Design a binder for this molecule. Structure first.
Ligand SMILES: Cc1ncc(C[n+]2csc(CCOP(=O)(O)OP(=O)(O)O)c2C)c(N)n1
Ligand SMILES: Cc1ncc(C[n+]2csc(CCOP(=O)(O)OP(=O)(O)O)c2C)c(N)n1
Ligand SMILES: [K+]
Ligand SMILES: [K+]
Ligand SMILES: [K+]
Ligand SMILES: [K+]
Ligand SMILES: [Mn+2]
Ligand SMILES: [Mn+2]
Lengths: 386, 336, 336, 386
């Protein structure tokens, strides 16, 4: 019997290399087909009508906002934008399975989580426009959302940095014994970063209640997954870290919901991490003219959820028309209001660098004030607060 | 924008900055069979088009994409260079160079020294978009040169135009030391200029006096050179002040003699850079100049730099050391 | 070695530097139920014994080992701090802090700013052994403070003795900003001194004039403070020169007023640090002092620093800015 | 049928999380027992007598050098040292399976690879003493060996940095088409670093002829593996990256040799990476009083190889005695000579920072020369060259 402390195993007397199983990888969990039909009754979550309608409306409201802000960027009204096309179901489905106070870390494609948590259209817009209503004070590029009230940690551009951070927040939650989980979203490209290896390993060895949620949409900007990794996607990496893992159909809100609900339940009870890899397809551009490269007319999360609603008698064409009209109205009202607000006071460029403001930093702020007194006509002072 | 671009080796062709980078890379792969180019999204031409057509021309084994992992990109590049092959790595935005900081500072920079020259990674070059772009905010705007300036063993080079970029980049690729080449991204598409089609080199560790002057010395690099060139014009017209304008070009090892020689003549110095004041590279130039020209300095050296804060989105117009800020400090310094 | 250590709050007990760190950590976990300490090998007491007995006293869930991954240690620490819990991370040698450079510079330092203060990691402190040790060579000797000084949003603090270490470390742990605390490892076991058993704080961003003088100002931090204290003695005895000796203590935000006020009085300045000259923090102090005290400076400010090379093994005695090197530069500066 | 570009798999209609198999991990390949007996004839490599004696003598010569240098450190004659106790077989066994020109990257416990490649005792000593004969010019701490002639890349202290570097060297070798492999050694602790995730993934996606050789000895200084990871050791991580993997008994030179020989053969032919995890036990201290914690009297690589030799009639007590005497003599001759050599010229502190020497660096070197002219009596000038 092998006595090595590093592993638990039997001896083998024949030389055999372990081959990866990639052609036949971890199967994709599915609950409803492309026609919105429940495939296996025992897996139907039987979510109440009001909640399913909220899943639907959240993801179509997000889609309406995406269309409008995407165009706004094209016109140079906002400096940058990233859509959520094809990611709507992974976000609303997983957000619906969380408790309102579960802390969320993510990056660029999680707006739907905030939408499900009722983040105001006015605040999505304030951040993209960097106006006076932005609690982020206009400091970050557009779509770098954050909400303390809705436990959505501020997004940052450096990929994967939020992964080991989410693990630390989960360790602290374990200690506070508040029966809270942390969920951390990231794409399959970001999973190649060293920080992903750091977070996955720490979560397992430090026994943290965290759900790692990987959105695998086949591309990281122009890079196909064939150039991103050679194993069986990201799901197959979880067991190597001792992490309970699963792969789901990301265009199926119910598959996503069921996997997330069960992961949250076990993660909080057992203080162990879970990895969910949601297979999807980035329908829209990365940010970038996508056309280095079907999922809109044959396999779209919104379309599948809509068919499900119809089969239950929960939606119809007139309701569809009225909602498209109402959501467009709601989004355009927030948009116009956002465009008209002034930007924050230029002095806000100096606060929050440290909690307090160092004297030498105050001197730089005074320096600017003096500069503007004399050269102000050469600056856009009328567009900024005070 | 906040600057205006303006300005022997054979046939030339008009090229903007990104095209001049492609030209330098093309010349390199053509004359050096071992050279390869790699990084995130370089295969289809790059997010800033610097590698367009190179994969089709040289092969998928020479121009290829790596997984999304900066520490791996640099460690991988070091390894290619250790065998003597030319490795030209791309880091997508200079703001994302930090994950590779350990591989750069603890490994690349110390590779030759620590081995007694038994091994080296001299044929490694890391190129990366750099500097503000009007709305880049915290992570699409950084100027990390001062972090690298404190690391013996690497060279850090920054061009100010398409002509300068191709010549300095070919010198970096051919230099026998690991080099970091920062490409001012706001210039990628801004105004083209004539650039030789064939390879030529511009020396490293050599500053360029682009305009002689006798009243004060102005030093900058990258896009900021255009800002001080304009400031020189404003000073001459509004104050009758003759400005000597110098592009440093190489951050380390830097051209100490050119700067001191200029200050010995003018007796005044103003250094400017987008990067934050504290710990910025202007503090090193100022210290050194004070030590070499104490007798000639007629006034305190001034540094007009970005503020000591992260780079903001909506406040960028108020953050950058623009021509008015440089002008004002110059005015006060001239009146000292 | 190359230095000699020498030198209100209640009962005190003799403690060497590592014991004073343990005392500060013990006081912290006792009064702050959320505080946890973690990193490589901290559970059994640490490779430099700074955490001995803390796990037995406070629990395995509060003093624990992490996998061998510096970028993870810091990202993990940031996350704990994001929930408001006190996170005291250890990086085994400052030389190995670079893998975490991106988490420190792009994340920790910018966390509060970029979120409009909706989130922060102010309760994070990163402590790490620092400085030469006689035979540490390239990776057991580094002084990385200047790399971090160019990053707005973090504080970098370095003590010179057991008493200073416990007071500055408690202030770092309690400060509402992410702090990096560098512990001069050559002092861990070198000479003890009286240290209060109970918690006390020493302010951050405040330099300490440890000896008044009128002819020249000498500035340093860490072990180098002991070197300049001795240099002061040599100057007084061999040259009749009165030296004002200042321990900077906090690298950023630094105490600009104390240094300038001192130089305005003496009119001369010599700054010294083990870290390489180029891009070293002395260049920032010198630049700033030149800008604020141009009228009072009677000679060029001198910087006596480690050479612009990686830190060598067998040549260490010839590399460090020892008392003789500082003395000689002081002599020349006094004779200017 | 699933149509996602990120993975190849079937749909599954039932929610099932994938559980890691850690209690029954990848089995440990063994060729001979603790009594040096070949367990399975079909696996005997039938290495020739001369080569097996070289494996034996190399690892006992290494052990003799270890004892002596370890004591030297204790006395403060050298500033630092790391032994190879219990790692002797993993190193000689794998080195014997490589071609002489295969490039080796490693760290602290690979001295046996250099020994097998006939690195002179005089050079091992010169580096530890940093004397004039050191080609590394006395710049690095002891045991940071390097040899260009024997294709052993200079060791550096930062853990795991050599992993993605080894991958780049392997990519370049692929392109040069020289039919060479690269082997990269690292411990189970170093495998937690982000650079390990970087190298493993790049090697698979860029199809590199490299062998990753992980020495799992159950500890990283004071940290047991239970705090280092929770999956089935390092071997189980390989398949998740699409890497052919195997685990071997590291105290069995023949198991190590067979696994390495086969990995080298396939890696060079197929341009694909292989991962070998050798289970061992760090018998000696880390560097550190090991006594945070059998393998010397019941399962030691040297002892097992010795029993094998006896069963073939290839060794005996008198040969054992004479060799212990001769190797001790050889090591003590190198040791005394090393101690007596002066250290290199202090000027060597300035060269090789860059290939050429920058003018400003020369000025610092001149500065020192001037300093020594005046204050030389305060420096150990007589101990250094010229
Ligand atoms: C450290 C870092 N490197 C590079 C980038 C540039 N970048 C932004 S998004 C992106 C692609 C990420 O792909 P993935 O993680 O799969 O997410 P997706 O965009 O497909 O949702 C890259 C390379 C970055 N933001 N941060
Ligand atoms: C980046 C880095 N972090 C920390 C250290 C300090 N250190 C030196 S050896 C070591 C343990 C490594 O353990 P392992 O990789 O398992 O190898 P072993 O010593 O057991 O052979 C540590 C933490 C280092 N050298 N480099
Ligand atoms: K992030
Ligand atoms: K180069
Ligand atoms: K703090
Ligand atoms: K290494
Ligand atoms: Mn993707
Ligand atoms: Mn180990």
């Amino acid at each position: 019997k092998p006595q090595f402390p590093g592993a638990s195993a039997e001896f083998i007397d024949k030389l055999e290399f372990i081959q990866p199983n990639v052609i036949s990888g971890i199967p994709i969990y599915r609950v409803m087909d492309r026609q919105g039909q429940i495939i296996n009754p025992s897996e139907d979550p039987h979510l109440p009508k009001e909640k399913v309608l909220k899943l639907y409306k959240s993801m179509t409201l997000l889609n309406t906002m995406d269309r409008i802000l995407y165009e706004s960027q094209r016109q140079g009204r906002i400096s940058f934008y990233m859509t959520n096309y094809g990611e709507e179901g992974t976000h609303v489905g997983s957000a619906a399975a969380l408790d309102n106070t579960d802390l969320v870390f993510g990056q660029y494609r999680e707006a739907g989580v905030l939408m499900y948590r009722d983040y105001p259209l006015e605040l999505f817009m304030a951040q993209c426009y960097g106006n006076i209503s932005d609690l982020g004070k206009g400091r970050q590029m557009p779509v770098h959302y954050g909400c303390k009230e809705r436990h959505f940690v501020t997004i940052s551009s450096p990929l994967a940095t939020q992964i080991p951070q989410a693990v630390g927040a989960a360790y602290a939650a374990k200690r506070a014994n508040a029966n809270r989980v942390v969920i951390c979203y990231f794409g399959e490209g970001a999973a190649s970063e060293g920080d992903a290896h750091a977070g996955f390993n720490f979560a397992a060895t430090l026994e943290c209640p965290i759900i790692f949620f990987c959105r695998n949409n086949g591309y990281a900007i122009s890079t196909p997954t064939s150039e991103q990794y050679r194993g069986d996607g990201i799901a197959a990496r979880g067991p190597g870290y001792g992490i309970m893992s699963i792969r789901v159909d990301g265009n199926d809100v119910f598959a996503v919901y069921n996997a997330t609900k069960e992961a949250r339940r076990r993660a909080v009870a057992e203080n162990q991490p879970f990895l969910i890899e949601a297979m999807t397809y980035r329908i829209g551009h990365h940010s970038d003219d996508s056309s280095y490269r079907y999922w809109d007319k044959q396999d779209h999360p919104i379309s599948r959820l809509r068919h499900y609603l119809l089969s239950q008698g929960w939606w119809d064409e007139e309701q569809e028309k009225a909602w498209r009209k109402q959501s467009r109205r709601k989004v355009m009202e927030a948009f116009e209001q956002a465009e008209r607000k002034p930007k924050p006071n230029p002095n806000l460029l100096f606060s929050d660098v440290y909690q307090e403001m160092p004297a030498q930093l105050r001197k730089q702020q005074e320096s600017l004030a003096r500069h503007l007194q004399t050269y102000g006509e050469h600056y856009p002072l009328d567009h900024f607060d005070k | 924008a906040h600057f205006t671009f303006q300005p022997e080796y054979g046939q030339t062709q008009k090229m903007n900055l990104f095209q001049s980078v492609t030209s330098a890379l093309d010349n390199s792969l053509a004359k050096d069979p071992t050279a390869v180019i790699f990084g995130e999204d370089v295969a289809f031409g790059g997010v800033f088009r610097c590698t367009v057509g190179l994969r089709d021309k040289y092969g998928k084994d020479r121009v290829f994409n790596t997984p999304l992992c900066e520490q791996g990109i640099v460690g991988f590049g070091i390894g290619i260079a250790v065998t003597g092959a030319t490795a030209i790595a791309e880091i997508q935005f200079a703001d994302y160079i930090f994950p590779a900081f350990d591989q750069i500072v603890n490994e690349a920079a110390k590779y030759r020294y620590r081995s007694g020259d038994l091994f080296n990674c001299g044929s490694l070059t890391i190129r990366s978009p750099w500097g503000c772009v009007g709305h880049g905010a915290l992570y699409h705007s950084q100027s990390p040169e001062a972090f690298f300036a404190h690391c013996p063993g690497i060279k850090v080079v920054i061009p100010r135009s398409p002509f300068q970029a191709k010549g300095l980049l070919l010198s970096c690729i051919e230099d026998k030391n690991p080099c970091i080449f920062f490409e001012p991204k706001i210039l990628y598409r801004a105004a083209a200029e004539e650039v030789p089609i064939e390879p030529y080199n511009i020396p490293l560790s050599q500053a360029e006096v682009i305009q002689e002057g006798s009243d004060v010395t102005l030093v900058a690099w990258g896009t900021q050179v255009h800002v001080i060139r304009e400031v020189a014009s404003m000073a001459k017209e509004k104050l009758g002040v003759s400005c000597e304008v110098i592009d440093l070009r190489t951050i380390i090892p830097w051209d100490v003699d050119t700067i001191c020689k200029s200050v010995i003549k003018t007796g005044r110095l103003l250094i400017s850079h987008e990067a934050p004041l504290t710990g910025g590279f202007a503090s090193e130039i100022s210290s050194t100049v004070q030590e070499e020209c104490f007798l000639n300095l007629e006034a305190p050296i001034s540094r007009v730099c970005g503020y000591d804060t992260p780079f903001p989105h909506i406040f960028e117009p108020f953050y950058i050391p623009d021509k008015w800020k440089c002008y004002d400090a110059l005015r006060k310094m001239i009146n000292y």
